[PDB]
């Protein structure tokens, strides 16, 4: 009918746009550099159907919203060190290739 | 790499009713030219078994009421229609008798605990009778396929009968959409899907093949001809 | 087998339908006539008009140069070559001009070469610089004089309407408050008293002998300072004609604006004398005022229209009469008259060049043909024809088009006060002029009314101006009834009686009101001159093509009145079942077909040219084939006749473009049931039966035309060769034979359509490179590919190739441009999702889905339907009669007939029944024969149609059928599943056209590529191609939502912002991450762009003092 | 009961009312339609695929001495229904026309396992210069197929033509109720399987049922 729990999300955070950001930053955080940021991984994994068979989908926000609607994460004025917020990523397998 | 010349027939099996069935890639034009006749026959031509006439000591005509019975005639009448019998496999087509006591809930089992004919739906209100719980029913049951209203005529117990209707047909609902998909590149290939609902004894899937059989069983009729130049 | 419906018809829509022009031009281009007769208007006038040129010293010395008979002549080229060599189909025109001396000297320079006056094709249009153009007839305020209320604050003003916008000045006498009676000629306001003084009038002899009964005078006297002496007068007036000219009484200047027929003259009156007289105190002559008598001037129209003014400023002769847009005040200058005035200009300049060469040069050597430099009559003349808001291309999609476009009337003329796109007074004019002979249901949108079409039987006779229809007057002739005609009423069509129409209540119009029934019932001159030869004359030639206009609501009825222009010839032109006689004439004035001349005979061979009629003489007739339409309509002719004689009720001798055997045939008529089909015909979309494609129906063939010029620019000569460097790819000559592509070749997008290399010297192949080059035989290169190739538009099959090269004969090409390859490509299109179908009743719609015969609605005997026009809204919402076509449909399908049910007269519901009633006793007359009859399905319905009190109860099922056939039609099964459609579903053969609007030409898609080098934002290019616009309206759209980022991206990573652009394409090609912006170029650039003007745009941060780091690279 | 009475007023290739009979109240279409549906779709047939003409570089042409017009031709030729009288294959008719005559599909060179169901079939009114040498394919096929099935062959001026296979030309069916059996309630079929190019109704009808069966079959083992 639309987005799985779109309404549920609109409940969590306050300003309708606030969420759009979270999911955005999050997607722009999740399958953005790593992938090992997940929280749905177990029996609750966003799998895609496709002739051959199932397998996750390359749509960042997709996992995002539904990973948010999960439980973990957090938002607002925490992890003050944005610097140390992206660097801490170095602390655990980051980067890619070109 | 996922269809070729052999669609993928996939069911859903719920346990006794709703069982989504879905063969897949099919040339555009058979979802209808196929998934329909079944849904048709499915709603009809199917051996079934359900109540059909009732004698219940006193007052003939279905219109009236009885004392020491929270309900009225028709409520039992219809409350009866939601009965699910299973005549093993002989030839069967018998009657039935209920033993009504005092102030209790007359289930749909308080009948003649006769084997050879089990009741799938044990419960089922049927009727309520307090204190002086009279009530004596010799509720019949017949054998049919389509649907039959007040047209058969409740012979049986000559006098007194309030014949109910022939709701005999194991299936109780049959719908089907035919969204198109293209697991096989070409963006417009038919894709059935069925949703056979049945509880009147006979399982869903069973209903299907049965019909699917009823159809071919029939199709063979176009075999040896007898022309005219 | 043609059935007709109708009554009377004393004439015919009249010959030809292109008479507005054709018979117009010629009579303005007289010429063809022996150089004796022919006296005015047209070229000649312009000549005579330009008074024999003199010069300084009025009647003192030599040189007079008088003009004479001119000579249109030996036409340079021929139509066809002109278009092939992009040439205006002109022709030479010279005229012997013998100049004089004042010591006796008669010299006649024979001919004296001159301008090239463009000729007009038999057709009724022009060939100009190759393409075909048409001169559209404009309308303006008819010459004369007729005040009108001062729109300001109540106070009638006076206007003087000179003849044509180029034969007199617009003079408005405006009685104000602070200034009073003003004479404002062109660019000059001045005391109206003054000019009068000059004309003689004056205090007392003037007012107090003119303007008494209505004050409005002291103000006219006060400036009597002017009314103190003429002569000295002119001078002050002259002084009031900028700039600082020489105050020295001359009489000239005023030697016009009244004097002689020079820049003022309604000619021999006609619409000036014949009008102002019956508007003013009678009396007048050729022009306004009169001088050169022997001294002072003698006014003729300057106080009487001032008088008649005041009169309507406080007296009884009101007549506030504004432009009154009465077509007794709205003129129309036919082409010839537009082309004429232009001559009345070419000369205006020549006369200058002549008067000038007069002097200088030797009075004994100064002869004509040496005094006349043929530059004016050209230029300014060839200036008009291809550079006038009135000269236009030519709607050539389907033939009705062309023809139609000539009958059209523009008011957006470029004349004086000629309504600009929104000129001073617009949403007023538009409205239906109560004059009916210039249709009411034609116009479009946005130009709503400033462009109308003129009625059929309209005009044809002694024409001085304005349409004038034909109107019967009891048998005999029909009189070309004026437009300012009262002629004692008019009796509308119908209620006849042999010759005495026994209606004794006859409906009629008189002056305006439908006024009940004058009842003169004289049987004599039709109750005066009452009666209209047929209705037709009420409407547009290309509306009369509507079988049931009656029911059709005006508004929507116009949406078909136009639309059907946008036909688009097909292969199976099909005339329509219900058509209207006209269908048969429209395509015979278009000349889009090939007629005959005398009696019969044939001979021929058939194919490329119906060979010689063979009648007495011997003339072959070639057949234009797979031409090219201005719109890319591919209009070709078909050969009709094997080996016979003249005509068989019509000598079609081979059809034309979009005409079935002689009958105009825009689209194809097909069978259709009405009814909402699972949404596929939602709103307006029509669902369609695949069959139509399988039977090559709506298929239309279009031929394109790609071009290429071979420049010369300073780098090396631009050449058209088949040696395109590197393009080896077995492509080159895998097609492109010795340069250009080959006929019958098949072209996809990208292939080299017409190759040609180019030098360009970017950089120098430095060493190393040149070395390595030599080394590995890397032959150095100096020439680029710069070929042609076919654009992202699929392409098609190479139909033909033309080639024009400098130095060629009749050609002539853009400076620098040498040679110019052209290549035509065909296309056949069938039909697809998208595209419009639109019928004759504006039931326009675009195809959605197209079902396979399999599905669709199976009629009873199995024949599938064709279109699934939705009944929802459309009809109700639009209230029309596209049903009374679908009914006389099967009642013409089964009865196998084509019909003629004309506009407002015929094909009546009972007849539609009578017919329909029949054509069933066979449709069903069969079934009860083939061996079948009404089945469970049909009964299941019928026994419910009466529930719907839709069919007479009690009757047998069979009885209920026919009953339910006249009205709607048979149960109509749904061949999809199998059961029936509870409720009949009227079925029938409508007639759907396929408007030049196929989807193909639309729909493109971008992603990257053709990036610009001028604006830096996607536009123009080479390879991919594309680019989409994102107007302001959409900015608000995003602003309104909250997609800030989503917005930025459209002013960042997707246009100007290079850093970004690239960032994007780099981001995607990699994957994982997304287009990351920051400081859009739009900002970094605004700063270092304001600086350039001496401003220090500072970028202070959060705390004012954190002054940006910005552009710090 | 227990079974019906499959009548079959046949014909000579085309026309084929084939009446079942006491079909219990209902199946009057369960059968009646699909066959009809299928009989209009999926069915093997004959159809032109491409034509080459003497001096014709490509369509949008005009062969001298011939009244017609190259597209018409291909539009006409689009019809010409062949018969193959053989198991699996395509082929190429061939015809040359002379001076004054009327090359109706008939003059199409007699040849091997082939019949010209629709002789006559006014193919082209050439005259005075009756020159017409042509070469038209004619592939076996199924259903409808246009610009895709390229008509290469004479690699040059093939001007491939459209594929209109389905040999069936119309299909309906009544349910007329006027039978015995057991109580006036049941229905009585009678699908017609109208006109055809080559194949005959019975064949269409027959071929039809098969398909419906094979599909019906697919309802096998599910996952
Ligand atoms: Mg629209």
Compact overview of the structure:
The structure holds 4 chains of a larger assembly. Chain A is mostly helical and 98 residues long. In chain A, 35% of the residues lie in helices and 0% in strands.
Keywords:
A: 98 residues; mainly alpha; Eukaryotic RPB6 RNA polymerase subunit; 35% helix; B: alpha+beta; Gyrase A, domain 2; RNA Polymerase Alpha Subunit, Chain A, domain 2; two-stranded antiparallel sheet; 9 strands; binds magnesium ion; DNA-directed RNA polymerase (chain A)
What does the secondary structure layout of this molecule look like, with pairings?
The structure holds 4 chains of a larger assembly.
Chain A: H1 6-12, H2 16-27, H3 60-68, H4 82-87
Chain B: E1 19-21, H1 32-43, H2 73-81, E2 85-86, E3 98-99, E4 104-106, E5 118-119, E6 127-129, E7 136-137, E8 171-175, E9 194-198, H3 204-219
Antiparallel strand pairs in B: 1-9, 2-5, 3-7, 4-6, 8-9
Helix pairs in contact in B: 1-3
Chain C: E1 2-4, H1 23-28, H2 42-49, E2 70-72, H3 81-84, E3 93-95, E4 126-128, E5 131-135, E6 137-141, E7 144-145, E8 158-161, E9 171-174, E10 182-185, H4 192-199, H5 218-222, H6 232-239, H7 273-276, H8 304-314, E11 330-333, H9 335-358, H10 380-385, E12 391-392, H11 399-407, E13 408-410, E14 451-453, E15 490-491, E16 508-509, H12 554-561, H13 583-586, E17 659-660, E18 663-664, E19 671-673, E20 688-689, H14 691-694, E21 704-710, E22 746-747, H15 769-775, E23 796-804, E24 818-826, E25 834-836, E26 846-847, E27 850-851, H16 874-878, H17 887-890, E28 898-900, H18 909-917, H19 923-930, H20 936-945, H21 957-966, E29 987-989, H22 1032-1040, H23 1044-1048, H24 1058-1070, H25 1081-1090
Parallel strand pairs in C: 1-28, 6-13, 20-27
Antiparallel strand pairs in C: 2-3, 4-5, 5-12, 6-11, 7-8, 8-9, 9-10, 13-14, 15-16, 17-18, 19-29, 21-24, 22-23, 23-24, 25-26
Helix pairs in contact in C: 2-9, 18-21
The structure holds magnesium ion (MG).
Keywords (chain A): DNA-directed RNA polymerase, Nucleotidyltransferase, Transcription, Transferase
GO molecular function (chain A): DNA binding; DNA-directed RNA polymerase activity
Enzyme class (chain A): transferase
């Amino acid at each position: 009918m639309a987005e799985p729990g779109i309404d549920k999300l609109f409940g969590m955070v306050d300003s309708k746009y606030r969420l759009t950001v979270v999911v955005a930053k999050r997607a722009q955080q999740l399958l953005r550099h790593r992938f090992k940021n997940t929280v749905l991984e177990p029996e609750e994994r966003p799998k895609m159907r496709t002739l051959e068979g199932l397998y996750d989908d390359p749509n960042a926000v997709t996992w995002a919203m539904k990973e948010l609607l999960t439980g973990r994460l957090f938002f607002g004025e925490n992890l003050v060190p944005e610097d140390r917020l992206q660097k801490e990523m170095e602390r655990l397998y980051p980067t890619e290739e070109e | 790499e996922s269809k070729l010349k052999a669609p993928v027939f996939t069911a859903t099996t719920q346990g006794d009713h709703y069982g989504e069935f879905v063969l897949e890639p099919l040339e555009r034009g058979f979802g209808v030219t196929l998934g329909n006749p079944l849904r048709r026959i499915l709603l009809s031509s199917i051996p079934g078994t359900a109540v059909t006439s009732v004698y219940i000591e006193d007052v003939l005509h279905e219109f009236s009421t009885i004392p020491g019975v929270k309900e009225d005639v028709v409520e039992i009448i219809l409350n009866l229609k939601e009965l699910v019998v299973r005549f093993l496999d002989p030839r069967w087509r018998t009657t039935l008798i209920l033993r009504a006591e005092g102030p209790k809930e007359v289930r749909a089992v308080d009948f003649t605990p006769s084997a050879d004919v089990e009741i799938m739906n044990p419960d089922l209100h049927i009727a309520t009778l307090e204190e002086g719980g009279k009530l004596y029913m010799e509720v019949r049951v017949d054998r049919g396929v389509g649907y039959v209203p007040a047209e058969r005529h409740g012979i049986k117990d000559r006098i007194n009968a309030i014949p109910v209707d022939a709701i005999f047909s194991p299936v109780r609902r049959v719908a089907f959409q035919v969204e198109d998909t293209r697991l096989g590149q070409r963006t417009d290939l038919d894709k059935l899907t069925l949703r056979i609902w049945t509880d009147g004894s006979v399982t869903p899937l069973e209903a299907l093949n049965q019909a699917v059989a009823i159809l071919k069983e029939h199709l063979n009729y176009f075999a040896n001809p007898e022309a005219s130049l | 087998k043609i059935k007709r419906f109708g009554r009377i018809r004393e004439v015919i829509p009249l010959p030809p339908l292109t008479e507005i022009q054709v018979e117009s031009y010629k009579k303005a281009l007289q010429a063809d006539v022996p150089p004796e007769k022919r006296e005015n208007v047209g070229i000649q006038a312009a000549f005579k008009e330009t008074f024999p040129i003199e010069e300084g010293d009025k009647g003192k010395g030599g040189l007079v140069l008088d003009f004479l008979e001119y000579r249109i002549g030996d036409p340079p080229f021929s139509q066809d070559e002109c278009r092939e060599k992009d040439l205006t189909y002109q022709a030479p025109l010279y005229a012997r001009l013998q100049l004089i001396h004042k010591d006796t000297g008669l010299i006649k320079e024979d001919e004296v070469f001159l301008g090239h006056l463009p000729l007009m094709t038999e057709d009724g249009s022009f060939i100009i610089n190759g393409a075909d153009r048409v001169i559209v007839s404009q309308i303006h305020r008819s010459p004369g004089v007729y005040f009108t209320p001062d729109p300001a604050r109540p106070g009638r003003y006076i206007a003087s309407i000179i003849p044509l916008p180029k034969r007199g000045p617009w003079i408005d006498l405006e009685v104000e408050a602070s200034g009073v009676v003003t004479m404002k000629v062109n660019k000059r306001k001045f005391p109206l008293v003054l000019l009068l003084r000059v004309l003689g009038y004056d205090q007392e002899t003037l007012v107090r002998e003119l303007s008494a009964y209505g004050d409005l005078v002291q103000g006219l006297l006060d400036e009597a300072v002017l009314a103190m002496r003429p002569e000295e007068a002119m001078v002050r007036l002259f002084t009031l004609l900028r700039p600082g000219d020489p105050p020295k009484k001359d009489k000239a200047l005023a030697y016009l604006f009244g004097l002689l027929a020079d820049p003022k003259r309604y000619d021999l009156g006609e619409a000036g004398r014949y009008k102002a007289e019956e508007k003013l105190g009678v009396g007048l002559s050729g022009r306004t005022l009169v001088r050169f008598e022997d001294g002072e001037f003698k006014d003729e129209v300057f106080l009487p229209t001032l008088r008649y003014l005041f009169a309507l400023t406080a007296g009884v002769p009101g007549h506030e009469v504004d432009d009154i847009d009465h077509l007794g005040n709205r003129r129309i200058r036919t082409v010839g008259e537009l082309m004429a005035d232009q001559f009345r200009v070419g000369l205006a300049r020549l006369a200058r060049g002549v008067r000038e060469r007069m002097v200088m040069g030797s009075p004994d050597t100064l002869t004509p043909a040496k005094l006349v430099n043929s530059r004016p009559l050209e230029a300014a003349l060839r200036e008009f024809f291809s550079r006038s808001q009135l000269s236009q291309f030519k709607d050539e999609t389907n033939p009705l088009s062309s023809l139609r476009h000539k009958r059209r009337i523009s008011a957006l003329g470029p004349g004086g006060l000629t309504r600009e796109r929104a000129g001073f007074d617009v949403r007023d004019v538009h409205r239906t002029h109560y004059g009916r002979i210039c249709p009411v249901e034609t116009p479009e949108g946005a130009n709503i009314g400033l462009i109308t079409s003129l009625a059929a039987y309209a005009r044809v006779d002694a024409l001085g101006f304005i349409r004038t229809p034909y109107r019967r007057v009891k048998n005999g002739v029909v009189t070309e009834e004026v437009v300012y005609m009262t002629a004692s009423e008019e009796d509308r069509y119908t209620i006849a009686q042999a010759n005495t129409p026994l209606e004794g209540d006859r409906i009629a119009t008189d002056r305006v009101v439908a006024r009940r029934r004058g009842e003169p019932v004289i049987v004599a001159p039709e109750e005066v001159e009452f009666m209209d030869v047929s209705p037709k004359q009420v409407f547009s030639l290309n509306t009369n093509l509507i079988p049931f206009l009656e029911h059709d609501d005006a508004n929507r009825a116009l949406m078909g009145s136009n639309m059907q222009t946008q036909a688009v010839p097909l292969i199976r032109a099909q005339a329509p079942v219900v058509m209207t006689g006209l269908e048969e004439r429209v395509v015979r004035d278009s000349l889009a077909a090939l007629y005959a001349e005398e009696d019969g005979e044939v001979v021929k061979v058939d194919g490329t040219r119906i060979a010689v009629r063979y009648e007495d003489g011997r003339l072959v007739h070639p057949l234009r084939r797979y031409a090219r339409s201005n719109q890319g309509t591919a209009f070709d002719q078909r050969p009709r006749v094997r080996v016979g004689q003249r005509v068989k009720k019509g000598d079609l001798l081979a059809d034309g473009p979009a005409s079935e055997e002689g009958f105009l045939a825009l689209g194809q008529n097909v069978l259709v049931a009405i009814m909402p089909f699972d949404g596929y015909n939602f709103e307006d979309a029509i669902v369609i039966s695949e069959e139509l494609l399988k039977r090559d129906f709506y298929t239309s063939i279009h031929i394109e035309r790609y071009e290429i010029e071979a420049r010369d620019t300073k780098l090396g000569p631009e050449r058209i060769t088949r040696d395109i460097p590197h393009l080896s790819e077995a492509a080159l000559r895998d097609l492109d034979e010795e340069g250009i592509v080959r006929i019958g070749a098949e072209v996809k997008p990208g292939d080299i359509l017409v190759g040609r290399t180019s030098f360009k010297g970017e950089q120098e192949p430095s060493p190393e490179e040149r070395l390595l080059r030599s080394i590995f035989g890397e032959k150095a290169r100096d020439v680029k590919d710069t070929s042609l190739r076919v654009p992202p538009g699929e392409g098609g099959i190479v139909v033909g190739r033309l080639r024009l090269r400098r130095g060629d004969p009749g050609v002539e090409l853009k400076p620098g441009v040498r040679e110019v390859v052209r290549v035509f490509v065909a296309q056949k299109r069938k039909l697809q999702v998208g595209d419009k179908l639109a019928n004759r009743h504006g039931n326009k719609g675009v195809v959605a889905k197209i079902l396979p015969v399999e599905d669709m609605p199976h009629l009873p005997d199995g024949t599938p339907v064709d279109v699934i026009l939705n009944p929802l809204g459309v009809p109700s919402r639009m209230n029309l009669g596209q049903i009374l076509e679908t009914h006389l449909g099967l009642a013409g399908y089964f009865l196998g007939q084509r019909y003629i049910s004309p506009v407002f007269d015929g094909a009546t519901e009972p007849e539609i029944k009578e017919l329909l009633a029949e054509a069933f006793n066979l449709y069903f007359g069969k079934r009860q024969g083939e061996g079948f009859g009404v089945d469970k399905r049909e009964k299941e319905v019928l026994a419910r149609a009466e529930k719907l009190g839709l069919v007479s109860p009690g009757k047998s099922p069979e009885e209920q059928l026919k009953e339910l056939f006249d009205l709607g039609k048979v149960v109509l099964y749904d061949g999809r599943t199998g059961e029936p459609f509870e409720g009949p579903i009227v079925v029938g053969q409508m007639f759907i056209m396929k408007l030049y609007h196929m989807v193909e030409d639309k729909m493109h898609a971008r992603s990257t590529g053709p990036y610009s080098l001028i604006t830096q934002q996607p536009l123009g290019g080479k390879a991919q191609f594309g680019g989409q616009r994102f107007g302001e309206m959409e900015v608000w759209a995003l602003e309104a939502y909250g997609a800030a980022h989503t917005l930025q991206e459209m002013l960042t990573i997707k246009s100007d912002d290079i850093e970004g652009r690239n960032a994007a394409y780099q981001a995607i090609i990699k994957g994982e991450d997304v287009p990351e912006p920051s400081v859009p170029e739009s900002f970094r650039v605004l700063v270092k762009e304001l600086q350039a003007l001496a401003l220090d745009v500072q970028t202070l941060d959060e705390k004012d003092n954190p002054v940006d780091i910005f552009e710090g690279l």
